[PDB]
Ligand binder design. Structure first.
Ligand SMILES: Cc1ncc(COP(=O)(O)O)c(/C=N/[C@H](Cc2c[nH]c3ccccc23)C(=O)O)c1O
Ligand SMILES: Cc1ncc(COP(=O)(O)O)c(/C=N/[C@H](Cc2c[nH]c3ccccc23)C(=O)O)c1O
Ligand SMILES: O=P(O)(O)OC[C@@H](O)CO
Ligand SMILES: O=P(O)(O)OC[C@@H](O)CO
Ligand code: NA
Ligand code: NA
Lengths: 267, 396, 396, 267
């Protein structure tokens, strides 16, 4: 299982995971594939990949506009699964996670969605607008298709929710840095050592911290606090948007940024 | 785990980001405790009666039904302070917001009526109110925007997507995701995640309870049917709720048909959409084959919403309530007919319900039937929309 | 000879061209017979309750009076169908018009509210309604003109004189002089020739009768004073009438002071005019030294009338009622204060009455007093006027 | 008494009275004086003279605009009384009647108004908006100052009103041709023989018919029906307004019209 293998290796090396997020198909299919190949080559330990959704209610403006760009290119979920199949054929060991909105999972059949995830080699699915309280049919279909169901540990979590997330989640636990929606401009400030340690006590999947992580200093800080890694999306997407007219300057700047973030995860 | 059932059959639920579940659970508990609190009930009743002006009239149409065997009553929510039924449940939600220690209100609006209601209740009860409105609707509804601001609300135009209600709902939910500690999200219809469909119904159900008492006093029997427009669901569930167990009483919900169902430019997901998950609920919605959420259309901004509350979806599924659609042109004819023949200027939303009742009367003019239309609002806000339509058709 | 006294002391009378006396005598007899007819009373009560929505609320202000010993209630005629008290007596006069065999209605309006009321009642009761409006007011009140026309009324702009109410009154009277056989002149205030000041009072006096019952239920005693704006007189006499014999209750009428009494640009004839004969009555009016009728001014079109009903002149003369004036700027501050602190958008007319009550509270904040303001109408019609003022002052 | 003398002479000659009305001071003081001198010289038996009022509610547009013209010239009631005094000094025998609105009579004192009428030599006053039911203080002050109070007999008159008008009126009775306001465009059509004969039975002052009389044919018809004369205002005022830029063409056309109307009153 790719997540267990990843975290075992990083543990041996005294390292945390750096996990970039991009929207599949932003700004186009071909450049998106080049972007992801660059994130990996530049040091990404895992991937989080979004499927453009018409109404992304957990995303701030940076990722809203990434969705809009994918739509301007005609990106459909079917094309995203084609991309996912190719990415997996290129990179057999990297964990591939999807960040989904519920309607895209539900509307052609929950089971069929996770069956297609298994066909293309996806390792995990987070459904942003399905809390653990609603997750049963999603969890069951993920597990039935050898997909890890990812659950969110919010900073306002209580003990009953910690136990649920620890018991039902697989692969990694998504540790939310703060309230609000995605965005690099808003950095989380609450200390999370208490939640991180509770999750370990309950044998939860290793925690990756996400939301508002956009500097190497935040990556080292999440690792110093016990988290097994960090996710960064808006910060990476902002580089895409800033360089739309220079596809190769974009890859250059993506490479530089990822290496600097992954470096901060080392030790 | 919840105190109340979050689902109406397969529909409803709480499909929100995990971070919002505590706020939904807190709101449910507050509501459940409020419904057992005579002090809360007494305060809510005092505001309804002495501030908003309940009970509202039940008006017999004198002229519209001439030459038929139809008797038609209009439940006059247009006479509530603010000009629409929205004021009933905003006053309840505002009181709940104070019970919970919240000092700010977030709301969204398309017609502006729920915005006006949110603003007036926040002014009265001392809350800071911010209102999201589709930038398109901000320009069409600039007088209602000014009303909201005169009453001290902040109004935030939303340039996104169809620039209408759905887009304002999205931004309100994003906002609430990062301010739920201090702000109560005042949802404007009987939709969204549990507990909102239940709370909005229970804070609107005096409409049907009053109607039942009034019609029994005037006619000695229950209506053959009650008719209401359906945008998200609140005014119709408010009318329906007390009749649900009176199985002889028909329940008719009217969705907007826009330019015609066959054009795809409508707002009728209950009958012409497909079950989906969005807005915090599992409900019928207008969506592409791929599951992207489609844009709705109606001449009436208040019905221009591509989903519908889950209890209506459920009542349809089991056959307890029947849902139909009325086109822009039919709604407009019913607006003109009410103005000219009863001297009541109805909201374009409510004009959809009236239009279907006129059809029931005109199609079967020798059928004896006792009908109640919920006149959910007055049409002052719509006279400019209507003027520009009649100007473009050479009618005036 | 008349059935009823046409004078209030020296004020009132029937100063109309001889050709109109039969119509005035017929109307008086119709009214006198109607007031003794239980069938008429039952029909009038049914329209008031089930069409117009009486009784209207009596609202305690929760925030406005903070820090004072003043308790302030607002009588919510703004919640009547049509949005103002005008609907009460138009429904009575319309019924009288049908009792008399008339099939047409003539009316005049400045704010448009009496025009809207005349039109809605004519639509409901099947009369052909024509409405005179000062061409200036036609352009400022184009939305109310469209409302009137949507309800089937003809609206006739008047380019004459000050192009405001007085000028529309003149044309309506000229019209009636040549159509009284088929048309009832629906006078819009408690002024004009007998019997109109008496009929309008008796068809408005439920405002004070309801207030008295409501305040005794809520406070256990009568108000220390009742406050109303005075344009022609109807809403104030309607509030006052049931308290006239309750000599402990103060009666305060508020005239518009416009830009200031000292500027001459006001509408305050009762306190700053001189007795004259015009409009069919002997009453205080704004006139030149030579006896030409002067033009009045107010920010509020409904108060912009250079005379006043004779019963107010009489109640002043004997000291039973006290009259004061409120300037545009004071009315505007009271409009903003009510919007922001109670969530009620008041008519600019009614904002004059509120403004004087705020003065009574603020000038003597440790004086214990129980006040009732007649909120004669809602301010939807005024939000454009108010917006353009706040725009020209850099306030918004 | 000038009215009794006039009607006695016309009776001897088998004639009815032609009585023009103009607004004093329309279009100016000097031209108005010239106009009235022309009406008399052209055959007018009596005069009816209006004092410009701000709100003439018994007048249609033609006489409304005559009032406006007088106001544009600055015409005040005091100037009108100066004109009246001069007119009387020029023409000692012609009856001079005023058509007044109530406020101009009442607002400096009813008695003072009629005292000023007597000082300048006015013979009668009609107060358009004072019905006989309200007339007591006006009647008393007229009679006290040797002024005839004129009352209107409307076509909807009943017997009680006929008796009042007959008993209280002096000089002439004003016989209204029709409902509505003044105006030459609207000709009365109701036959009035019945009212005319009742007034004679009750010993009323002789009746002059007015409103909408604008042709010689209407003058002869009022005389054929028993009325002692006819009044014409709007028809004459329309000639004034049509010739404002040609003061002497106006007098020429006024002369021609009056002579033709007075001719129709002969026999
Ligand atoms: C007068 C009137 N009648 C009927 C309706 C339909 O609403 P309902 O189906 O809930 O009974 C509205 C809606 N007005 C909407 C209310 C609204 C606010 N947020 C919403 C989200 C979804 C659907 C409707 C809304 C507006 O203010 O624009 C209305 O203003
Ligand atoms: C909402 C509201 N409040 C108060 C008033 C003052 O009237 P009131 O003094 O009689 O109580 C008005 C007048 N609105 C006038 C009513 C009117 C019609 N004809 C008139 C003649 C004289 C004076 C007023 C009127 C309008 O429609 O414009 C009004 O619309
Ligand atoms: O965009 P940000 O704020 O980095 O949040 C991470 C998110 O995009 C993927 O989970
Ligand atoms: O204007 P006319 O219609 O002629 O009426 C007469 C009147 O002006 C004088 O009494
Ligand atoms: Na809908
Ligand atoms: Na006045």
């Amino acid at each position: 299982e790719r997540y267990e293998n990843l975290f075992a290796q990083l543990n041996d090396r005294r390292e945390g995971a750096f996990v970039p997020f991009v929207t599949l198909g932003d700004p186009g299919i071909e450049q998106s594939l080049k972007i992801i190949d660059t994130l990996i080559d530049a040091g990404a330990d895992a991937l989080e990949l979004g499927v453009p959704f018409s109404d992304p209610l957990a995303d701030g403006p940076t990722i809203q506009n990434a969705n809009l760009r994918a739509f301007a290119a005609g990106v459909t979920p079917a094309q995203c699964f084609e991309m996912l199949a190719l990415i997996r054929e290129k990179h057999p060991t990297i964990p591939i996670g999807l960040l989904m909105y519920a309607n895209l999972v539900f509307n052609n059949g929950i089971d069929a969605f996770y069956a297609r995830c298994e066909q293309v080699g996806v390792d995990s699915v987070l459904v942003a607008d399905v809390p653990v309280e609603e997750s049963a049919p999603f969890r069951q279909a993920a597990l039935r298709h050898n997909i890890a169901p990812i659950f969110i540990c919010p900073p306002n979590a209580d003990d009953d929710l910690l136990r649920q997330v620890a018991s039902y989640g697989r692969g990694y636990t998504y540790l939310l840095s703060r309230s609000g929606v995605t965005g690099a401009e808003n950095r989380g400030a609450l200390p999370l050592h208490h939640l991180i340690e509770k999750l370990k006590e309950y044998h939860a999947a290793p925690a990756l911290q996400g939301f508002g992580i956009s500097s190497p200093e935040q990556v080292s800080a999440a690792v110093r606090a016990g988290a097994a890694g960090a996710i960064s999306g808006s910060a990476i997407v902002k580089i895409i948007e800033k360089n739309l007219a220079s596809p190769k300057q974009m890859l250059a700047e993506l490479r530089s940024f990822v290496s600097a973030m992954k470096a901060a995860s080392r030790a | 785990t919840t105190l109340l059932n979050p689902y109406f059959g397969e529909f409803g639920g709480m499909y929100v980001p995990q971070i919002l579940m505590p706020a939904l659970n807190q709101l449910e508990e507050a509501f459940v405790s409020a419904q057992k609190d005579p002090e809360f009930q007494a305060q809510f009743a005092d505001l309804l009666k002495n501030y908003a002006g309940r009970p509202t009239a039940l008006t017999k149409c004198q002229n519209i039904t001439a030459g038929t065997r139809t008797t038609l009553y209009l439940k006059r929510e247009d006479l509530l302070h603010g000009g629409a039924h929205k004021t009933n449940q905003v006053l309840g939600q505002a009181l709940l917001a104070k019970r919970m220690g919240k000092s700010e209100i977030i709301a969204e609006t398309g017609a502006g009526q729920h915005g006006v209601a949110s603003a007036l209740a926040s002014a009265l009860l001392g809350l800071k109110c911010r209102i999201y409105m589709g930038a398109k609707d901000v320009e069409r509804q600039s007088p209602n925007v000014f009303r909201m601001r005169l009453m001290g609300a902040e109004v935030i135009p939303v340039h996104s997507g169809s620039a209408t209600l759905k887009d304002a709902c999205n931004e309100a939910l994003r906002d609430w995701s990062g301010s739920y500690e201090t702000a109560h999200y005042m949802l404007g219809t009987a939709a969204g995640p549990h507990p909102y469909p239940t709370i909005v119904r229970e804070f609107q159900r005096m409409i049907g309870e009053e109607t039942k008492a009034q019609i029994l006093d005037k006619e000695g029997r229950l209506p053959d049917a009650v008719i209401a427009c359906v945008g998200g669901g609140s005014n119709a569930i408010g009318m329906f709720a007390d009749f649900i167990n009176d199985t002889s009483v028909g329940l008719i919900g009217v969705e907007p048909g826009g330019h015609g169902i066959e054009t795809g430019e409508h707002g009728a997901p209950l009958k012409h959409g497909r079950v989906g998950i969005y807005f915090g609920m599992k409900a019928p919605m207008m969506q592409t084959a791929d599951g992207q959420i489609e844009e709705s259309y109606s001449i009436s901004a208040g019905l221009d919403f591509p989903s519908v509350g889950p209890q209506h979806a459920y009542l349809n599924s089991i056959g307890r309530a029947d849902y139909v659609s009325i086109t822009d042109d039919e709604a407009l004819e019913a607006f003109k007919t009410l103005c000219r023949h009863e001297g009541i200027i109805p909201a374009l939303e409510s004009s959809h319900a009236l239009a279907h009742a006129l059809k029931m009367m005109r199609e079967q003019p020798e059928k004896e039937q006792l009908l109640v239309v919920n006149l959910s609002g007055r049409g002052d806000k719509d006279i400019f929309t209507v003027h520009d339509i009649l100007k473009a058709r050479g009618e005036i």
